[PDB]
C-alpha cells in the first residue's frame, strides 16, 4: 500500500523540518533578533508546506480513496487513545473557523440556485480572467587609508 506513499512522508518530514527551526526560534525569545533574516527564513520555510501541500494534490486520489487507516497495527493498549485523537486528526476549532468560512461563505447561496446561478459563478470567474490579458498587455508597456603597514605590505603587493 503506497510503495511511493512513504516518499511522500519523507517530503512531509522535509516540510515538518520547517517547523523544527521555527519553533525553537520562538523559544529563542524574548531577546530580539534579525527580523528581516528570520521573517524571511520563517516565510520561506512556510511556503514549502503548501508546496508539499501542493505535491499532495497530485496524489489527491489517495487521500480520497484515502488509502486510509487499514494502517493501525500496534495494539497500544489504551494509551494510544491520545494517539487516537492523534491518529484521529479530524477538525479542530479550525473547524470552528471553517464555519467562519461558512458564514464568510455568507450569501449566496444554495440553497440558492441550481445551476444557472452556478453557471453565472463560472461565467463570473472567467470574466475576471480576460481582464488579466488586458493587464499583462499594458504591463509590458514600461517594462582613513589603511595603516601604512598594509601599504608597505602593499609595497609587498598585499591588497
Amino acid at each position: 500500500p503506497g510503495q511511493a506513499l512513504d516518499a511522500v512522508r519523507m517530503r512531509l518530514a522535509q516540510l515538518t523540518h520547517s517547523l523544527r527551526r521555527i519553533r525553537d526560534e520562538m523559544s529563542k525569545a524574548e531577546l530580539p533578533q534579525w527580523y528581516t533574516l528570520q521573517s524571511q527564513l520563517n516565510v520561506t520555510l512556510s511556503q514549502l508546506v503548501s508546496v508539499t501541500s501542493t505535491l499532495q494534490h497530485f496524489q489527491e486520489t489517495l487521500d480520497s480513496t484515502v488509502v486510509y487507516p487499514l494502517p493501525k497495527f500496534p495494539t497500544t493498549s489504551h494509551e494510544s487513545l491520545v494517539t487516537t485523537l492523534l491518529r484521529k486528526k479530524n477538525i479542530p476549532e479550525v473547524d470552528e473557523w471553517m464555519k467562519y468560512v461558512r458564514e464568510t461563505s455568507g450569501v449566496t447561496t444554495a440553497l440558492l440556485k441550481d445551476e444557472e446561478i452556478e453557471k453565472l459563478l463560472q461565467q463570473d470567474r472567467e470574466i475576471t480572467n480576460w481582464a488579466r490579458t488586458t493587464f499583462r498587455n499594458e504591463y509590458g508597456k514600461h517594462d582613513p587609508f589603511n595603516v601604512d603597514d598594509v601599504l608597505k605590505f602593499t609595497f609587498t603587493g598585499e591588497k
Binding site: 475576471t128 481582464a131 488586458t134 493587464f135 514600461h142
Partner: protein, 94 residues
C-alpha cells in the same frame, strides 16, 4: 565621482516614474470593465493598489530635492591665527 553615483541615483529615480505611474494605468482599466456585480473585486485590490502605490509617488518627490540639493547644497580658519598674531601685537604693547 559625485556625478556617476548621483547619475545612477537619478537613473534609479526615473525607474520609479515607470514604477508609480504604471500604478495609474493599472487603476484605469478597472473602471472600464467595471459596472458589474462583483466589479468591486478590483476595488479591494486596485484601491489597495493605488492607495498603496500612491505613497510610492511620495518617495518620488524626495529624489529631486536631492538633485535639487545639488542645486541647494583655503581651507583654513587661519584668519583666527590673525587672531593669534593679533593677540601677540596687543601682547607686545600691553
Amino acid at each position: 565621482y559625485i556625478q556617476e553615483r548621483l547619475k545612477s541615483l537619478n537613473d534609479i529615480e526615473t525607474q520609479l516614474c515607470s514604477m508609480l505611474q504604471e500604478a495609474s494605468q493599472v487603476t484605469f482599466i478597472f473602471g472600464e470593465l467595471k459596472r458589474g456585480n462583483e466589479s468591486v473585486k478590483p476595488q479591494f485590490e486596485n484601491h489597495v493598489k493605488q492607495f498603496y502605490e500612491r505613497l510610492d509617488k511620495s518617495t518620488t518627490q524626495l529624489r529631486k530635492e536631492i538633485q535639487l540639493l545639488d542645486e541647494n547644497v583655503q581651507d583654513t580658519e587661519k584668519m583666527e591665527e590673525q587672531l593669534d598674531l593679533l593677540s601677540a601685537i596687543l601682547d607686545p604693547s600691553k
